[PDB]
C-alpha cells in the first residue's frame, strides 16, 4: 500500500510450489513399475553422501575457524564446532546413521577419498554457490540487511524524538499566525530514487519554502503547496536523511554497495519504516509517509494524501 | 588490532584445509589404486547430481520471486532468473554438461537419467520443507560479511557519512581555537570515540567512571561536543574530546524492542563488527588522516586506564 | 546515445553465441555415435592439455618477475605467483586434477606424461619466442574497457574531479546573477559542453561557425566563462554558456608527438570512449543536477544547429 | 635514478630464462629416445587445435561486434574481422595449413565437434583467463594504462605552460627579496602513497610556507625547508595533482578503480613523467621530481636534492 | 550603486561600481572616497585634536 514498487515480505510460494511438485513427483515414481527397495537404497545413500560431505565441509570451514577461537567464540572450542557443523547432537546422529547404513548397503574406503575430493571442488571452484535470491531470503528472514539498521537508527534516533513535540509546535504556529492551518502530521518524503536535493524547489518549482516551524534542537519547514499559482494547502515536508546515506554509499568504492543493491535496500528501508511506525506509540497518525519514484508533480502527490 | 577480542577479517584457511585435504585425497586415491577411468566418471556424475539439484531447488525458489517481479525485480524476467540461478549463461552451460554427463554415460551405480529426474525432485522438496540443508551460522556470518549484509555495516557507514565526515574537517580548527584561548596543559588534537563492546552506554559520560569528568563545551547546525579531562590520582593527567558511539547505543535499544528480531547474541557480534568497519572506513578516508582514534573494550578494571595509555 | 558513433559498453554476445555453438556441437556428439566413455575422457583430457601448459608458461612468465619482487610486488613472492598463474588456490586445484587425469587415465591420442611434458614446454616456448599465441586487439580492447585500462578513462575522471566537480555547483548561481542584473533575452542555466570528436579544438569558438560569436565573459579559482549568442539568420535565437572540453584538446596534442605512441586511430578510439565515460559520470554525479549538457559531434553542418536543438 | 620502489621498464627476464629453461628442457628430448616422426606429428596436431582454438574464440567474439561495427569500426566489416581474428589472411592461412596437416596426420568429423565444444566451455566458464601479470605486460607495452593519460595531459596542459616562465618568475622574486635565494627548479612532490594534504605543513611541520610566486592565473607557493630550527633550503613545492586525482579516483565506486591500482598507477605515473621530462625541451634542469613512500623525513628528503 | 569589480593592479586597489538607474545599468565609473574627509571626521571625533564640528565642516569645504 505504501507504493506499487515496494517488495512485500517473502511469502510461501516456494513452499507451495514445492508441494505441488512433490505431489506430481511422487505420482511419476509409481509409473516406472519398479520395486522401491532400490529407490529406498538410492534415497538413503543419496542423503548419506550429503551428511558425510557436510562434515568435511564443516571440517574445511573449521580450519579457518580454529585460529578464530580467541576472536568470535569467547575462546571456546565447543561453540566453534557448533557454528560450522550446526547442532552437534542432531548432526552427530546423522554422521553415525550414514556410516552404519553405508556399510550394510552394497567399495568402502574409496568413496570417502572421492567424496572428500568432491567437497574440495565445491570449496575450490565454488560450484555450490549461494543464489542471491536465496541470499536475500535468508538475509531478510534473519534481518541481515543494511536497511534494517538504517531504519531502526532513524526511528530510535530522529523520529522518536520530534514526533511527541511536533503537533504541539504545529498547533502553536497555527494560533500564533492566521495564514489555512498547517496539518498536524509530518509528511516524510521517501524518494525511492535516493536522489535527495538540498532544496525542495529543485525537485519541483510549484513547491515553495514558506516558513520555519518554531522550536534537542530541530528545524522544520512549512511549504506553500501551490496549485494553479494559488495556495492549496500547507504541511511540514522532510526528506528521509538515510536515503542520502544509502545513496552516498553507492558513490563510494569502499562500501561494496552497488546501485542495484542501493535501490534494492532503499526499498526495504521504507518498508521496514512502515512496519516500525505502525506499532510505535509515538505514531498516533501524526506522521504520514509518502514515497515516489520518478518514471511527475511532487505537489499533487502531497495533495494526493491531503 | 583494536582489541584482543575484535574478530579479524576471514583468512584463506578454508581452501587451505581443502588443498591439504586434496593433498591427502590424491594420495588416498593413489594408495588404494582404484581404476582411474571410473574415478573420473564418478566425480563427474556426483557433480551431475549437485548441479542439476541447483535447478530444481532454484525453480521452487523461483516460484515466489515471480510474484515480486513487478516491485523487487523492476518488472523484468531476466532479473528474476539471474537472482535465483546465478549467471544464466554460465549456469546454463553447466546444466547441459550435467545432462550430457548423465543422459547416456555408463554408470555402475546410479539410476538412468529419466529415472533420476523423479528422484531428484522428491529429494529437493524434502530438504526444503524440513530445512535439512540448513545454513550453518558460521557460513551465514561468512557470506554476509563478504557481501556486506550485516546490519552493523550500515550503522558504521551512516555514522560516517552523516556525522563523522561532516565534523572531522572542522574538528582540528575547533580544537585549535579552544586551546589558543585557554590554559597554557592542552587538549589533544585527536578525537576519541568510545566503543564499549557491551553497548552499555550511560547517558552521562562521567557516570561510567569518576576519573573522566566533563570539563567544558567545545565552541562551535549545532555540533555540540564536550571536552573531558582524565583525573588520574587527583591531577590533570590528560584531556581530550571524548564521546560515546551513538550507533552502539541504537544497537542496545535495538535488541530491547521485540519488533526488531535482534537477539543479544547478534548484538554482541554487531557490537564487535561495527568497530572493525569503523576502523576500515577511518583507515583510508581523507578526513580521518590521523584525526581520530577509536577506543574499544569489554567491561568485565577502569575505563580511564585505557584512554590514558592512548594519549 | 549522445551520438550514433559512440560505442556502447561490451555486452555478453560472445557468451551468448558460445551457448548456441555448444548446443549444435552436442548434436554431432549424439549423431556420430562414438561411445561417451571416450568422449568424456577426451574432453577431460583435452581440457587437461590446455591447463597443464599454463604452468610452464607461467613459470617462464615468473622468470622475469623474480627481479620485480622488490619493485612491483612489495617484496612478497606469493603475490607474484598469483599475478602470473592466476588464482593460486584454484589453478593449482585444476593442475592437480589434470596431473592425476593424465598420469593415470588412458591416453588414446597424445604422448604420455613423461613424453607430453617434453612437448608441452616446446610448444609454449615456440609460442613465447615467435608470439604465435597472440592477442588480437578485440581481446585486448575487451580487457581494456572491462578492466578500465584506457587513457580516456583517466582523462574523463580527471576532467570531472578537477574541473566539472568544482564549477557546476557555482555555475547556476552566476547565471542567475547575470540574468538578474541585465535586461538585454536570457542565458540558459546549463553549461553546454562542446565535445568535438575529431579533437579539432580551436582557441576561438566564434571562428568555428559564423552563427556563434562572443557576447560577454560571465562574471564570477578564477574561472573565465564566455557566453555566446547564436545568430540564426542574423537573429539571436538563443544564448548559452558554451565551451570546449580541454582533455579532447590534450588528446589531439598527444597524437602529434612521437613520444606518446598514440596513433591517429588510437586518438579516435580514446576520444569516443572519453565522451561516453563523461556522460556515465555526469549522469550519476550529484553535482550534475540537470546543470550540465553535453554536445558531441563528429565533423562530416553548422555548430549552431545542434547547440540550438538542445536549447 | 628516481626511487628503488619505482618499477623498472620491463627487461627481458623471460627470454633470458625461458631459453635457459628451454635449454635444460631441450636436453631431455634426446634423453627419452623416441622416434622423431611420432614426436613431429603430435606437435603439429597440437598447433592445429590451437589455430581452431583461436578461430572459435574470435568467431564467437565476432558475434558480439555485429552490434559495435557501426561504432568502433566505422561501419566496415573489414576492421570488424581484423580486430577479432587478427590478420584476415595470415590467421586464415594458418587454419587451412593446420587442417590439411590435421587430416593428413593419423574419427575426423567427431574430433572437430569435440574441439568446438571444448572451446565453448573455455569461453563461458573462462578457465583460460588472462593473468594480471600479462594484463600489465600488454597495457604497459601498448600504453593503455590510466596513469599514462594523467601524465601526458599534465604535461601538455600544465608543465609545458609554466616551466618556460618559471625561472623568470623565480629570478624576479630572488631579486626583490634579499637574504637565502630560492632554487630555480620546480620540485614536484610525488608521495607514492597518494596521501596529499592541502598544505605541506600537515604532511611535515619542518616545511614552512614562505610566500607565493608572482603570476590565466598560475599560483605556485615557495616553501621554507627548516633543519634543527634553522633554514636549510628554499624551493617551489607543488604536489603532482594527478596523484590527488588518482587517490580520489579510487574513492568513488563508479571509477572501477581498486586500491592496488592506485598504488600501481602512482608508481607508473612518476616513471612516465620521468620519461617525458628526460627528453623534453621544457626540461632544462628547472624541474626535479621527488618521489617517496613511508614503509620518515619528508623535509630532509628535499634537502638531499639540494 | 553596486560594486562591480576591482581594477587590475606599491600596490593600488580601486573599485568599479555599477551605476544603477530604475533597476538598469546606466553607467560604470571608478568611485573612491576622499579618505582625508574620513580623517577629518576622525579628527573631530577625538578630543585631543581641539577641532570642533563647524571646524570640520569648514575644513571639508576648504579641502
Ligand atoms: C547519520 C549520522 N549517524 N548515523 C548513525 C547510526 C548515528 C549517527 C549520528 O551520530 N548522528 C548525530 N549525532 C549527533 C550529535 C550532535 C551533538 N552532540 O551536538 C550533533 C549532530 O548533528 C546535529 C549529530 N548527529 C547528526 C544529526 C542527527 C540527528 N538528526 C537526524 N537523524 C539522522 O541523522 C539519522 C540517520 C540515521 C540512519 N539515523 N539517524 C538518527 C541519528 N535528523 C535530524 C534533523 C535535524 C533538523 N531538521 O534540524 C536535526 C537533527 O539533529 C539535531 C539534534 C541532535 N540531537 C539529537 C541526536 O543526539 C544529539 C542531539 C537530526
Ligand atoms: C591539463 C593539465 N592537467 N592535467 C592533469 C591530469 C592535471 C592537470 C592540472 O592540474 N592543471 C593545472 N593545475 C593548475 C593549478 C593552478 C594554481 N593556481 O595553482 C593554476 C592552473 O592554471 C589555471 C592549473 N592547471 C592548468 C589549468 C587548470 C584547471 N582548469 C581546468 N582543468 C582541466 O581542463 C583538466 C584537464 C584534465 C586532463 N584534467 N583537468 C582537471 C584538472 N580547466 C579549466 C578551465 C578554466 C576556464 N574555462 O576558465 C580555468 C581553469 O583554471 C582555474 C582553476 C584553478 N585551480 C584548479 C585546481 O585547483 C587550483 C587551481 C581550468
Ligand atoms: C560420489 C558417489 C560415488 C557417491 O558416493 N554417491 C552417493 C550414492 C548415490 F546417490 C546413490 C547410490 C549410492 C551412492 Cl554410494 C554417488 C552418486 C552418483 C549419482 O549419479 N547419483 C544419482 C542420484 C541418486 F542415485 C539418487 C538421488 F536421489 C539423486 C541422484 F541425483 C554418482 C557418484 C556418487
Ligand atoms: C580434441 C583432440 C581430439 C584434438 O583434436 N587434439 C589435438 C591433438 C594434439 F594436441 C596432439 C596430438 C593429437 C591431437 Cl589429435 C587433442 C589433444 C588431447 C591431449 O591430451 N593433448 C596433450 C598434449 C599433446 F598431445 C601435445 C602437447 F604438446 C601438449 C599436450 F598437453 C586431447 C584431445 C584432443
Numbering used by the authors:
A (entry chain F), D (entry chain D): 5 to 110, 116 to 188, 192 to 227, 238 to 317, 323 to 333
B (entry chain E), C (entry chain C): 5 to 188, 192 to 227, 238 to 317, 323 to 333
E (entry chain B): 219 to 227, 238 to 291
What does the paper say about this structure?
In the second class, we found a bilayer of STING molecules devoid of curvature. Using 3D classification, we parsed out two distinct conformations from this class. In the first conformation, two copies of STING are present on either side. In this structure, which we will refer to as the together conformation, the neighboring dimers on both sides of the bilayer form interactions in the LBD and TMD. The lateral oligomeric interface is mediated by the same structural motifs as the SR-717 structure, namely through backbone hydrogen interactions from Q273 and S275 in the LBD α2–α3 loop and hydrophobic interactions in the TMD. We also observe density for C53 at the base of the TMD and modeled the ligand in the same orientation as the higher-resolution SR-717 structure. Instead, the head-to-head interaction appears to be facilitated by the loop following the LBD α1 helix which interacts with the β2 and β3 strands as well as the post-β3 loop of the opposite layer. Further comparison of the autoinhibited head-to-head interface with that of the diABZI-3 structures reveals that it buries nearly twice as much solvent-accessible surface area with an average of 1258 Å2 compared to 664 Å2 for the together state and 589 Å2 for the apart state. The average distance between the α1 helices, as defined by the distance between the Cα atom of H185, in the together and apart conformations is 42.3 Å, which is roughly 10 Å shorter than in apo STING and 6 Å longer than the SR-717 complex. Our diABZI-3 structures also display the same 180° rotation of the LBD relative to the TMD that was seen in the SR-717 complex as well as in cryo-EM structures with cGAMP.
STING plays essential roles coordinating innate immune responses to processes that range from pathogenic infection to genomic instability. Its adaptor function is activated by cyclic dinucleotide (CDN) secondary messengers originating from self (2’3’-cGAMP) or bacterial sources (3’3’-CDNs). Different classes of CDNs possess distinct binding modes, stabilizing STING’s ligand-binding domain (LBD) in either a closed or open conformation. Here, we explore the conformational and oligomeric states of full-length human STING in the presence of closed-LBD (SR-717) and open-LBD (diABZI-3) non-nucleotide agonists, lending insight into potentially distinct modes of activation.
